[PDB]
Amino acid sequence: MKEQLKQMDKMKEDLAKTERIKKELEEQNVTLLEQKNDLFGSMKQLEDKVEELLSKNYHLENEVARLKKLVGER
Amino acid sequence: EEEMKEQLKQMDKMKEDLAKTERIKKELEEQNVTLLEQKNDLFGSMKQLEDKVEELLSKNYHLENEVARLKKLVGE
């Protein structure tokens, strides 16, 4: 019966360790989900930015081309 | 001294509380490694998006200088 109290003593520290690590992982898990979400939010902003710049790029190409003719270039 | 059955059992419930917690722990490590991979892939896409943003900003800049040059050329 004495060894059990001991076997239990060790077991208590193992459970305590495993539990604390389980809690760290839960927190980590929560941080990752919120980080993936942040990246989705950032990509949506960049995609719209790319859209906007693309329109500006196409508009600018049309201006240059028109002005190229007007001045007799290339 | 017949109190042993109490802790001898308390011992058994602890043996399972430990196996359970370890099983959940390993599951979480697993899921977290997955989320980590998914987080990196997303991060990569974003970077590429950023690469595209810079390139466009750069082409547009050159293009705006052309308009400027050409306009000046017309006025001379």
Place of tokens 């997303």: B42
The structure was resolved experimentally with: X-ray
Class in CATH terms, A1-74: mainly alpha
Which residues of chain B neighbour A19 with C-beta distances below 8 Å?
Answer: 21
B76 close contact with A: CB closer than 8 A? no
Domain residue limits, chain A: 1-74
Q: What is the CATH number that goes with domain B1-76?
A: 1.20.5.340
A4 close contact with B: CB closer than 8 A? yes
> Any residues with CB less than 8 A from the CB of A30 and at least 6 apart, and which?
none
CB contact under 8 A, B56 and A61: no
Place of tokens 């950032």: A42
**CA angle B1–B7–B22, rounded 5-degree value:** 165
Beta carbons within 10 angstroms of residue A22's beta carbon: 19
Nearest to B74 among A21, A56, A70 (CB): A70
The resolution of the experimental structure, rounded to one decimal in Å, is 2.5
